[PDB]
Tab-separated table of C-alpha atoms in Angstrom:
chain	number	residue	atom	x	y	z
A	290	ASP	CA	-22.183	14.820	16.938
A	291	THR	CA	-18.399	15.147	16.512
A	292	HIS	CA	-17.400	15.026	12.821
A	293	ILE	CA	-14.002	15.141	11.003
A	294	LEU	CA	-12.793	15.291	7.387
A	295	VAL	CA	-10.505	12.688	5.754
A	296	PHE	CA	-8.768	13.847	2.545
A	297	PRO	CA	-6.918	11.048	0.730
A	298	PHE	CA	-4.810	11.517	-2.393
A	299	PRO	CA	-6.957	10.116	-5.265
A	300	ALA	CA	-4.574	7.327	-6.342
A	301	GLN	CA	-3.637	3.619	-6.176
A	302	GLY	CA	-3.405	2.413	-2.543
A	303	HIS	CA	-3.944	5.861	-1.004
A	304	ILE	CA	-7.760	5.794	-0.689
A	305	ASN	CA	-8.468	2.351	0.853
A	306	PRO	CA	-6.270	2.907	3.962
A	307	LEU	CA	-8.034	6.214	4.832
A	308	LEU	CA	-11.439	4.632	4.105
A	309	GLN	CA	-10.612	1.724	6.451
A	310	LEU	CA	-9.476	4.158	9.185
A	311	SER	CA	-12.689	6.159	8.585
A	312	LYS	CA	-14.703	2.949	9.227
A	313	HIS	CA	-12.901	2.390	12.573
A	314	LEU	CA	-13.619	6.023	13.566
A	315	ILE	CA	-17.347	5.695	12.702
A	316	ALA	CA	-17.449	2.483	14.802
A	317	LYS	CA	-16.159	4.499	17.806
A	318	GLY	CA	-18.774	7.288	17.440
A	319	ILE	CA	-17.066	9.811	15.088
A	320	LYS	CA	-18.961	10.886	11.927
A	321	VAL	CA	-16.572	11.037	8.937
A	322	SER	CA	-16.764	13.154	5.761
A	323	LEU	CA	-14.480	11.963	2.943
A	324	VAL	CA	-13.270	14.925	0.834
A	325	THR	CA	-12.612	13.731	-2.726
A	326	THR	CA	-12.763	14.381	-6.490
A	327	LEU	CA	-15.667	13.937	-8.942
A	328	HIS	CA	-13.817	10.994	-10.576
A	329	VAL	CA	-13.377	9.150	-7.244
A	330	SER	CA	-17.003	9.642	-6.153
A	331	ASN	CA	-18.026	8.608	-9.706
A	332	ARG	CA	-15.467	6.101	-11.161
A	333	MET	CA	-15.077	3.926	-7.971
A	334	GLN	CA	-17.492	2.028	-5.617
A	335	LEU	CA	-17.592	4.915	-3.040
A	336	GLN	CA	-21.329	4.557	-2.480
A	337	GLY	CA	-21.671	5.604	1.230
A	338	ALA	CA	-25.307	4.399	1.017
A	339	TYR	CA	-26.115	3.312	4.601
A	340	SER	CA	-26.843	5.844	7.348
A	341	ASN	CA	-23.682	4.812	9.273
A	342	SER	CA	-21.541	5.175	6.119
A	343	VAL	CA	-18.764	7.686	5.400
A	344	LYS	CA	-20.318	10.852	3.914
A	345	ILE	CA	-18.767	11.580	0.486
A	346	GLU	CA	-18.056	15.288	-0.148
A	347	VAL	CA	-17.158	15.971	-3.807
A	348	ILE	CA	-15.264	19.311	-3.839
A	349	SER	CA	-13.803	19.216	-7.401
A	350	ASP	CA	-15.268	19.715	-10.926
A	351	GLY	CA	-12.849	17.350	-12.732
A	352	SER	CA	-10.683	20.146	-14.154
A	353	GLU	CA	-7.881	18.906	-11.848
A	354	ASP	CA	-7.614	15.591	-13.793
A	355	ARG	CA	-4.275	14.580	-15.409
A	356	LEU	CA	-4.097	15.553	-19.130
A	357	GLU	CA	-2.447	13.322	-21.772
A	358	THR	CA	-0.021	16.197	-22.481
A	359	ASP	CA	0.896	16.501	-18.772
A	360	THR	CA	4.084	15.504	-16.988
A	361	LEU	CA	3.708	14.287	-13.358
A	362	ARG	CA	4.960	17.755	-12.305
A	363	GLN	CA	2.344	19.741	-14.265
A	364	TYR	CA	-0.430	17.399	-13.017
A	365	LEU	CA	0.556	17.676	-9.323
A	366	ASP	CA	1.077	21.465	-9.735
A	367	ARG	CA	-2.430	21.960	-11.188
A	368	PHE	CA	-3.991	19.512	-8.685
A	369	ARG	CA	-2.455	21.447	-5.767
A	370	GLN	CA	-3.621	24.830	-7.152
A	371	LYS	CA	-7.216	23.686	-7.906
A	372	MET	CA	-7.737	21.481	-4.819
A	373	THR	CA	-6.297	24.212	-2.541
A	374	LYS	CA	-8.991	26.625	-3.750
A	375	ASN	CA	-11.567	23.795	-3.655
A	376	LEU	CA	-10.685	22.944	-0.034
A	377	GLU	CA	-10.643	26.659	0.935
A	378	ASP	CA	-14.176	27.060	-0.523
A	379	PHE	CA	-15.386	23.877	1.207
A	380	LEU	CA	-14.026	24.842	4.649
A	381	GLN	CA	-15.419	28.405	4.304
A	382	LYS	CA	-18.995	27.011	4.380
A	383	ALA	CA	-18.089	24.213	6.841
A	384	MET	CA	-16.097	26.154	9.470
A	385	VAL	CA	-19.156	28.477	9.900
A	386	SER	CA	-21.879	25.826	9.903
A	387	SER	CA	-23.951	24.608	12.888
A	388	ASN	CA	-21.680	21.527	13.363
A	389	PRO	CA	-18.164	22.387	12.078
A	390	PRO	CA	-15.593	19.593	11.514
A	391	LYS	CA	-13.198	19.217	14.482
A	392	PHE	CA	-10.287	17.683	12.529
A	393	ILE	CA	-8.906	16.882	9.065
A	394	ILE	CA	-6.759	13.789	8.348
A	395	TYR	CA	-5.046	14.193	4.950
A	396	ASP	CA	-2.657	12.099	2.867
A	397	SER	CA	0.988	12.901	3.919
A	398	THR	CA	1.802	13.323	0.143
A	399	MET	CA	-0.364	16.544	0.183
A	400	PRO	CA	1.483	18.657	2.858
A	401	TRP	CA	-0.178	21.871	1.434
A	402	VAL	CA	-3.467	20.743	3.131
A	403	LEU	CA	-1.843	21.551	6.540
A	404	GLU	CA	-1.424	25.220	5.465
A	405	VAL	CA	-5.154	25.383	4.531
A	406	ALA	CA	-6.114	23.769	7.864
A	407	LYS	CA	-3.775	26.195	9.725
A	408	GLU	CA	-5.407	29.171	7.953
A	409	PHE	CA	-8.869	28.025	9.138
A	410	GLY	CA	-7.784	27.027	12.681
A	411	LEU	CA	-8.631	23.358	12.054
A	412	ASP	CA	-6.736	20.578	13.948
A	413	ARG	CA	-4.937	18.391	11.374
A	414	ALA	CA	-2.752	15.288	10.956
A	415	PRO	CA	-0.964	13.887	7.870
A	416	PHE	CA	-1.466	10.149	7.230
A	417	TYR	CA	1.648	8.245	6.066
A	418	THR	CA	0.191	5.401	3.933
A	419	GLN	CA	3.572	3.692	3.279
A	420	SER	CA	5.871	1.804	5.703
A	421	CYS	CA	7.515	3.744	8.506
A	422	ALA	CA	10.851	2.509	7.109
A	423	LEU	CA	10.095	4.588	4.008
A	424	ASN	CA	9.427	7.615	6.267
A	425	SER	CA	12.981	7.105	7.611
A	426	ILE	CA	14.493	6.742	4.122
A	427	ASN	CA	12.673	9.812	2.710
A	428	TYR	CA	13.500	11.955	5.776
A	429	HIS	CA	17.223	11.084	5.524
A	430	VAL	CA	17.222	11.763	1.769
A	431	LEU	CA	15.658	15.166	2.526
A	432	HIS	CA	18.351	16.022	5.137
A	433	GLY	CA	21.426	14.708	3.254
A	434	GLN	CA	22.185	11.698	5.529
A	435	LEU	CA	21.418	9.496	2.459
A	436	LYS	CA	22.080	10.377	-1.208
A	437	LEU	CA	20.215	9.442	-4.494
A	438	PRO	CA	23.058	7.022	-5.267
A	439	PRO	CA	24.588	6.178	-1.802
A	440	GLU	CA	28.319	7.114	-1.230
A	441	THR	CA	28.691	4.170	1.165
A	442	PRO	CA	27.834	0.541	0.091
A	443	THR	CA	26.142	-0.100	3.488
A	444	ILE	CA	23.607	2.437	4.844
A	445	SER	CA	22.953	2.667	8.605
A	446	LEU	CA	19.966	4.907	9.429
A	447	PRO	CA	18.723	5.521	13.016
A	448	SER	CA	16.774	2.486	14.385
A	449	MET	CA	16.846	0.754	10.961
A	450	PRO	CA	18.385	-2.515	9.712
A	451	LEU	CA	21.530	-2.171	7.563
A	452	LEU	CA	20.668	-1.611	3.887
A	453	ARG	CA	22.685	-1.997	0.687
A	454	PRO	CA	21.946	0.213	-2.406
A	455	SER	CA	19.865	-2.720	-3.859
A	456	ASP	CA	17.487	-2.465	-0.806
A	457	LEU	CA	16.739	1.290	-1.284
A	458	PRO	CA	13.633	2.478	-3.201
A	459	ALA	CA	13.996	2.615	-6.990
A	460	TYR	CA	12.241	5.824	-8.104
A	461	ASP	CA	14.189	5.552	-11.435
A	462	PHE	CA	11.670	2.913	-12.748
A	463	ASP	CA	9.795	5.731	-14.604
A	464	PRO	CA	12.727	8.040	-15.647
A	465	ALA	CA	10.552	11.054	-16.604
A	466	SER	CA	9.047	11.341	-13.087
A	467	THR	CA	12.131	10.373	-10.978
A	468	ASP	CA	13.026	13.836	-9.595
A	469	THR	CA	9.326	14.750	-9.226
A	470	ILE	CA	8.595	11.635	-7.129
A	471	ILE	CA	11.677	12.211	-4.924
A	472	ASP	CA	10.686	15.847	-4.309
A	473	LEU	CA	7.088	14.742	-3.627
A	474	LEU	CA	8.189	12.040	-1.113
A	475	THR	CA	10.822	14.225	0.598
A	476	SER	CA	8.392	17.133	1.035
A	477	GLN	CA	6.162	15.137	3.429
A	478	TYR	CA	8.249	16.208	6.477
A	479	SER	CA	8.576	19.986	5.860
A	480	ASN	CA	5.719	21.299	8.027
A	481	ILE	CA	5.219	18.530	10.667
A	482	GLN	CA	5.918	21.009	13.517
A	483	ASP	CA	2.357	22.355	12.948
A	484	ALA	CA	0.730	18.901	12.800
A	485	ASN	CA	-1.382	17.870	15.824
A	486	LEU	CA	0.027	14.317	15.384
A	487	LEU	CA	1.260	11.910	12.647
A	488	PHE	CA	-0.688	8.768	11.586
A	489	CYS	CA	1.247	5.777	10.192
A	490	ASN	CA	-0.170	2.817	8.217
A	491	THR	CA	1.800	0.251	10.277
A	492	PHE	CA	1.758	-1.529	13.677
A	493	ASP	CA	4.119	-1.393	16.697
A	494	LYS	CA	5.326	-5.027	16.485
A	495	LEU	CA	6.198	-4.550	12.794
A	496	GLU	CA	8.190	-1.261	12.925
A	497	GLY	CA	8.067	-0.207	16.609
A	498	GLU	CA	11.713	0.909	16.767
A	499	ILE	CA	11.367	3.027	13.587
A	500	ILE	CA	8.204	4.639	15.013
A	501	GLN	CA	10.183	5.522	18.190
A	502	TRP	CA	12.683	7.317	15.898
A	503	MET	CA	9.801	9.145	14.159
A	504	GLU	CA	8.538	10.429	17.555
A	505	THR	CA	11.951	12.136	17.996
A	506	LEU	CA	10.895	14.563	15.216
A	507	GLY	CA	8.774	16.409	17.821
A	508	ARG	CA	5.162	15.320	17.363
A	509	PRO	CA	3.035	12.394	18.628
A	510	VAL	CA	3.123	9.424	16.165
A	511	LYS	CA	0.118	7.061	16.091
A	512	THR	CA	0.310	3.638	14.440
A	513	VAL	CA	-3.232	2.695	13.263
A	514	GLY	CA	-2.442	-0.152	10.811
A	515	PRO	CA	-2.800	-2.558	9.221
A	516	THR	CA	-5.798	-1.152	7.306
A	517	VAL	CA	-7.140	-4.579	6.199
A	518	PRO	CA	-10.924	-5.218	6.553
A	519	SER	CA	-11.628	-7.043	9.852
A	520	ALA	CA	-13.731	-9.655	7.944
A	521	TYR	CA	-10.348	-11.353	7.340
A	522	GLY	CA	-26.426	-16.581	2.012
A	523	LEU	CA	-28.220	-19.221	-0.132
A	524	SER	CA	-29.363	-18.305	-3.695
A	525	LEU	CA	-31.064	-20.708	-6.144
A	526	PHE	CA	-30.569	-18.318	-9.117
A	527	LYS	CA	-26.873	-17.576	-8.440
A	528	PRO	CA	-23.789	-19.636	-7.543
A	529	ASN	CA	-22.333	-19.539	-3.982
A	530	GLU	CA	-19.127	-17.669	-4.901
A	531	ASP	CA	-16.702	-16.379	-7.649
A	532	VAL	CA	-14.885	-18.533	-10.243
A	533	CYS	CA	-11.437	-18.062	-8.586
A	534	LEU	CA	-12.676	-19.341	-5.184
A	535	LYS	CA	-14.386	-22.347	-6.867
A	536	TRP	CA	-11.168	-23.255	-8.754
A	537	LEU	CA	-9.139	-22.905	-5.490
A	538	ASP	CA	-11.808	-24.979	-3.602
A	539	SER	CA	-10.894	-28.137	-5.668
A	540	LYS	CA	-7.173	-27.854	-4.728
A	541	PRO	CA	-5.457	-29.404	-1.677
A	542	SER	CA	-4.816	-26.974	1.197
A	543	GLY	CA	-1.581	-24.879	0.975
A	544	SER	CA	-0.738	-26.047	-2.573
A	545	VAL	CA	-1.449	-23.104	-4.910
A	546	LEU	CA	0.858	-20.171	-5.711
A	547	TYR	CA	-1.216	-16.970	-5.949
A	548	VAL	CA	0.637	-14.712	-8.456
A	549	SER	CA	0.077	-10.928	-8.797
A	550	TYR	CA	2.469	-8.042	-9.529
A	551	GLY	CA	-0.369	-5.551	-8.964
A	552	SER	CA	-2.500	-3.356	-11.225
A	553	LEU	CA	0.169	-0.690	-11.981
A	554	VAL	CA	3.443	-2.433	-12.949
A	555	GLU	CA	4.099	-2.624	-16.733
A	556	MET	CA	6.512	-5.593	-17.081
A	557	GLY	CA	8.569	-6.371	-20.223
A	558	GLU	CA	7.595	-9.385	-22.398
A	559	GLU	CA	11.188	-10.744	-22.133
A	560	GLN	CA	11.006	-10.725	-18.298
A	561	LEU	CA	7.321	-11.722	-18.530
A	562	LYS	CA	8.178	-14.835	-20.609
A	563	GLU	CA	10.849	-16.064	-18.133
A	564	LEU	CA	8.503	-15.405	-15.160
A	565	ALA	CA	5.662	-17.385	-16.784
A	566	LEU	CA	8.073	-20.202	-17.796
A	567	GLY	CA	9.560	-20.076	-14.277
A	568	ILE	CA	6.065	-20.597	-12.832
A	569	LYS	CA	5.400	-23.302	-15.467
A	570	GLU	CA	8.641	-25.224	-14.625
A	571	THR	CA	7.626	-25.599	-10.897
A	572	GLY	CA	4.599	-27.767	-11.876
A	573	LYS	CA	2.582	-26.262	-9.006
A	574	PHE	CA	-1.083	-25.189	-9.159
A	575	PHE	CA	-1.191	-21.393	-9.530
A	576	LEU	CA	-3.837	-18.642	-9.793
A	577	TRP	CA	-2.364	-15.625	-11.627
A	578	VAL	CA	-4.416	-12.366	-11.671
A	579	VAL	CA	-3.109	-10.092	-14.471
A	580	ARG	CA	-4.720	-7.155	-16.342
A	581	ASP	CA	-5.567	-7.190	-20.102
A	582	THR	CA	-2.634	-4.987	-21.299
A	583	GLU	CA	-0.084	-7.113	-19.351
A	584	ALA	CA	-1.702	-10.440	-20.422
A	585	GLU	CA	-1.068	-9.609	-24.167
A	586	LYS	CA	2.725	-9.692	-23.511
A	587	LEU	CA	2.487	-13.308	-22.227
A	588	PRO	CA	4.379	-15.798	-24.430
A	589	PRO	CA	2.257	-17.321	-27.242
A	590	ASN	CA	0.470	-20.596	-26.175
A	591	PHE	CA	1.474	-20.076	-22.488
A	592	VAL	CA	-2.013	-20.403	-20.911
A	593	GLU	CA	-2.840	-23.442	-23.145
A	594	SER	CA	0.520	-25.028	-22.154
A	595	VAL	CA	-0.316	-24.762	-18.413
A	596	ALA	CA	-3.945	-25.831	-19.048
A	597	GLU	CA	-4.169	-28.231	-16.081
A	598	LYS	CA	-1.928	-26.369	-13.610
A	599	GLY	CA	-2.669	-22.672	-14.213
A	600	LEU	CA	-5.753	-20.466	-13.827
A	601	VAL	CA	-4.913	-17.079	-15.450
A	602	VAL	CA	-7.756	-14.555	-14.932
A	603	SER	CA	-8.215	-10.766	-15.248
A	604	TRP	CA	-9.543	-10.334	-11.682
A	605	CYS	CA	-10.297	-11.977	-8.275
A	606	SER	CA	-10.565	-10.337	-4.850
A	607	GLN	CA	-6.962	-10.507	-3.508
A	608	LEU	CA	-8.221	-10.723	0.131
A	609	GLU	CA	-10.541	-13.718	-0.420
A	610	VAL	CA	-7.835	-15.495	-2.521
A	611	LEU	CA	-5.080	-14.884	0.132
A	612	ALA	CA	-7.533	-15.984	2.887
A	613	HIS	CA	-8.264	-19.266	0.990
A	614	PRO	CA	-6.678	-22.374	2.660
A	615	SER	CA	-5.684	-23.873	-0.758
A	616	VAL	CA	-3.231	-20.950	-1.246
A	617	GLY	CA	0.207	-21.624	0.244
A	618	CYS	CA	2.380	-18.889	-1.258
A	619	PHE	CA	2.114	-15.342	-2.712
A	620	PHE	CA	4.304	-14.346	-5.657
A	621	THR	CA	4.076	-10.562	-5.149
A	622	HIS	CA	5.588	-7.254	-6.340
A	623	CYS	CA	5.757	-6.183	-2.619
A	624	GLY	CA	3.550	-3.087	-2.676
A	625	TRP	CA	2.832	-1.884	0.890
A	626	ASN	CA	-0.849	-2.947	0.723
A	627	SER	CA	0.085	-6.376	-0.732
A	628	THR	CA	2.922	-6.626	1.853
A	629	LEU	CA	0.515	-5.949	4.776
A	630	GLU	CA	-2.090	-8.305	3.242
A	631	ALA	CA	0.452	-11.160	3.113
A	632	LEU	CA	1.385	-10.517	6.798
A	633	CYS	CA	-2.271	-10.263	7.908
A	634	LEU	CA	-3.318	-13.497	6.189
A	635	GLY	CA	-0.227	-15.527	7.197
A	636	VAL	CA	0.889	-16.314	3.632
A	637	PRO	CA	4.638	-16.724	2.782
A	638	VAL	CA	5.928	-14.679	-0.148
A	639	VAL	CA	8.148	-14.897	-3.205
A	640	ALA	CA	9.302	-11.265	-3.395
A	641	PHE	CA	9.588	-9.861	-6.928
A	642	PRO	CA	9.871	-6.088	-6.324
A	643	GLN	CA	9.502	-3.890	-9.397
A	644	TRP	CA	9.806	-0.227	-8.397
A	645	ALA	CA	9.736	2.490	-5.675
A	646	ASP	CA	9.243	1.236	-2.065
A	647	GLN	CA	8.638	-2.399	-3.227
A	648	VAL	CA	12.397	-3.183	-3.005
A	649	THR	CA	12.500	-1.909	0.636
A	650	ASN	CA	9.330	-3.876	1.582
A	651	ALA	CA	10.959	-6.967	-0.025
A	652	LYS	CA	14.121	-6.407	2.068
A	653	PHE	CA	12.042	-6.378	5.289
A	654	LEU	CA	9.896	-9.345	4.176
A	655	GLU	CA	13.018	-11.458	3.452
A	656	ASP	CA	15.698	-10.317	5.953
A	657	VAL	CA	13.727	-8.754	8.845
A	658	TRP	CA	10.282	-10.387	9.096
A	659	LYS	CA	11.608	-13.594	7.405
A	660	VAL	CA	8.382	-14.762	5.675
A	661	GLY	CA	9.878	-15.508	2.236
A	662	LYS	CA	12.679	-14.828	-0.250
A	663	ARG	CA	13.549	-12.327	-3.036
A	664	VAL	CA	13.934	-13.621	-6.634
A	665	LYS	CA	17.650	-13.221	-7.477
A	666	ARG	CA	17.912	-10.774	-10.378
A	667	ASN	CA	20.830	-10.313	-12.794
A	668	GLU	CA	22.944	-7.228	-13.612
A	669	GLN	CA	20.457	-6.491	-16.482
A	670	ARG	CA	17.587	-6.640	-13.778
A	671	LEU	CA	16.186	-9.700	-15.611
A	672	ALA	CA	15.145	-12.580	-13.352
A	673	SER	CA	15.819	-15.819	-15.306
A	674	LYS	CA	13.308	-18.722	-15.352
A	675	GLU	CA	15.563	-20.929	-13.140
A	676	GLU	CA	15.883	-18.146	-10.521
A	677	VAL	CA	12.076	-17.706	-10.620
A	678	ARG	CA	11.473	-21.492	-10.460
A	679	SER	CA	14.216	-21.923	-7.828
A	680	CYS	CA	12.870	-19.126	-5.605
A	681	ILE	CA	9.296	-20.490	-5.731
A	682	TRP	CA	10.594	-23.980	-4.853
A	683	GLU	CA	12.817	-22.686	-1.995
A	684	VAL	CA	9.942	-20.814	-0.261
A	685	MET	CA	7.348	-23.549	-0.846
A	686	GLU	CA	9.371	-26.786	-0.875
A	687	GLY	CA	12.954	-26.066	0.398
A	688	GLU	CA	14.787	-26.137	3.761
A	689	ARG	CA	13.103	-23.039	5.212
A	690	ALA	CA	9.544	-23.741	3.965
A	691	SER	CA	8.432	-24.667	7.510
A	692	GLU	CA	10.366	-21.632	8.881
A	693	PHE	CA	8.704	-19.144	6.491
A	694	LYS	CA	5.227	-20.608	7.201
A	695	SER	CA	5.927	-20.466	10.968
A	696	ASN	CA	7.084	-16.819	10.741
A	697	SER	CA	3.944	-15.974	8.618
A	698	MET	CA	1.537	-17.452	11.188
A	699	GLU	CA	3.325	-15.436	13.919
A	700	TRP	CA	3.109	-12.132	12.008
A	701	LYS	CA	-0.536	-12.971	11.277
A	702	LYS	CA	-1.181	-13.326	15.041
A	703	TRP	CA	0.523	-10.033	15.985
A	704	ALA	CA	-1.260	-8.192	13.141
A	705	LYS	CA	-4.704	-9.336	14.354
A	706	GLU	CA	-3.660	-8.522	17.941
A	707	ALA	CA	-2.761	-4.955	16.845
A	708	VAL	CA	-6.207	-4.134	15.344
A	709	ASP	CA	-8.182	-6.217	17.871
A	710	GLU	CA	-9.785	-4.512	20.916
A	711	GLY	CA	-7.021	-3.211	23.211
A	712	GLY	CA	-4.280	-3.771	20.597
A	713	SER	CA	-1.526	-1.197	19.900
A	714	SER	CA	-3.395	0.229	16.840
A	715	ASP	CA	-6.926	0.057	18.365
A	716	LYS	CA	-5.569	1.848	21.497
A	717	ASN	CA	-4.122	4.672	19.347
A	718	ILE	CA	-7.467	5.035	17.506
A	719	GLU	CA	-9.419	5.037	20.817
A	720	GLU	CA	-7.103	7.726	22.284
A	721	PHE	CA	-7.558	9.903	19.170
A	722	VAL	CA	-11.355	9.435	19.362
A	723	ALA	CA	-11.242	10.313	23.099
A	724	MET	CA	-9.408	13.578	22.325
A	725	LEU	CA	-11.982	14.448	19.620
A	726	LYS	CA	-14.801	14.061	22.165
A	727	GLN	CA	-12.992	16.391	24.635
């Protein structure tokens, strides 16, 4: 029984992609062990309860956790030191067992795992969870072809669309961690000559040309995305579904604006007021999922003022909401997972990027894939309520509303084609599985 290890970075949007890939591998006959921390096995729904499930291997004691007194640098430095020893101890017992693992797939953001794999003679591959366009940007920042602030107002990178400085990732959003994040992201290409191959969370039709560029770095590159669950009885003591779905069920098809800037962005009340008022001014039905600490910054009386039009809740499953036919538009922060979800479910977007790679994903969503528009922001970075209202109207009601929806249904078709049997991504996964059986 061939078995491999998958080692994701324990953080927002890094685990689900590797878990999804693990599920595809198990469906093709490969047993998968997920190497993770005590907190992820504990404080998350990683149950691995069925006999065909991913096996969870906890290798940490929780002493690698981020302290309140820690900077990002101290946290990543301690994590690397402790998890390196933890992985060395784990492989020691596993590389001399009856059935040793034949491969380790690890998050690309932990390039130190390759050195551990190399030391034990274990085949390995980093997994790039972000867009391939970001791989190009980070590589060119690493090699001096692009600079923190760009010298030239137009940036032309190999096999990439032209970008202005307002389309490049904003790592300055959290000033204390700016240099740390840039060093982290640029250090993902330093030891790729020893990688068996590179895995990318994308699909050929989406970034094919950029992937061709990536292959020129010397190693095989395998697109295996998008990592969205393929899914997208009768109880007398329970209701059929969730409250969100029920509320959406009573709306006309394609009429509601699903709003979510994700679970990590901390927006300012000033900008939060204008955004809420912007959504209010449109007079459209909208389902806004926002966490408790962000919801307290909402303007006083806002939810009562949009009583008939708005449903503001603390949680709903994003996938089931985006797959609902009553939803016609997605006001999103343009995180890579959200970006791929929008494309996979054929839903046009109002791009409101906040930080990091979100601005680059927004650029591709608006100017390259053409499935929506970016909210115009001012010099201060504040998006006014008319810009917000205008943008929502333009994508849902304006001249290009039919265009955007047509582009979205096309990207939705190619995305399903990619992960469907014989698709570009499925083919890459089958070839990898075939090599592991050799």
